[PDB]
Amino acid sequence: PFDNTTYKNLQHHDYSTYTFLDLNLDLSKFRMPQPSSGRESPRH
Amino acid sequence: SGVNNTKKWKMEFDTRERWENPLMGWASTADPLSNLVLTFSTKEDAVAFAEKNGWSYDVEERKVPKPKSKSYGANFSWNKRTRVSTK
């Protein structure tokens, strides 16, 4: 079963416009809570 | 931004009337001291000169800019308002 003769990175032929952001949205549940600077923004 | 014209003390006199010349519209004056500006190393030298010449005077203290605390790193503060939004 050692076939070193085919290209095994064909998945990206089926990627679309929102593939990257859908994965980021999917990943959202696995993240740790973010740290906070103590204010809403540098202009607060 | 150059500061080289703020090194010496100056003595000037009170401004007096200037009027328009009827012929040409030039600025006329009757004040012989209108252009006299004296330079002095120290405030004390300027006062001494004015006293012996009999001139009434006012002294204005020198205005040195105060030292500032400058930090480039402050532009990128994690939790302070000094963080710049642009460069």
Cα distance between residue B60 and residue B41, in whole Å: 15
Instruction: Reduce the DSSP state of residue B51 to 3 states and report it.
Output: helix
Cα distance between residue B16 and residue B29, in whole Å: 8
Of B77, A35, A40, B69, residue with least CA distance to B85: B77
| Contacts of B30 by beta carbon, 8 Å cutoff, 6+ apart | B16, B17
Cα distance between residue B10 and residue A2, in whole Å: 93
Phi-psi region of B25 (alpha: psi -120 to 50; beta: other; left: phi over 0): left
Cβ-based contacts under 8 A for chains A and B: 12
Give the closest of B79, B82, B85 to A38, CB-based: B79
Cα distance between residue B21 and residue B74, in whole Å: 59
Give this entry's resolution in angstroms: 2.3
Method: cryo-EM
CB proximity under 8 Å: A 5-44 to B: 37-39, 42-43
Q: What angle do CA A34, A37, A42 make, to 5 degrees?
A: 125
Distance from CA of B52 to the nearest CA of A (A): 60
Cα distance between residue B11 and residue A10, in whole Å: 86
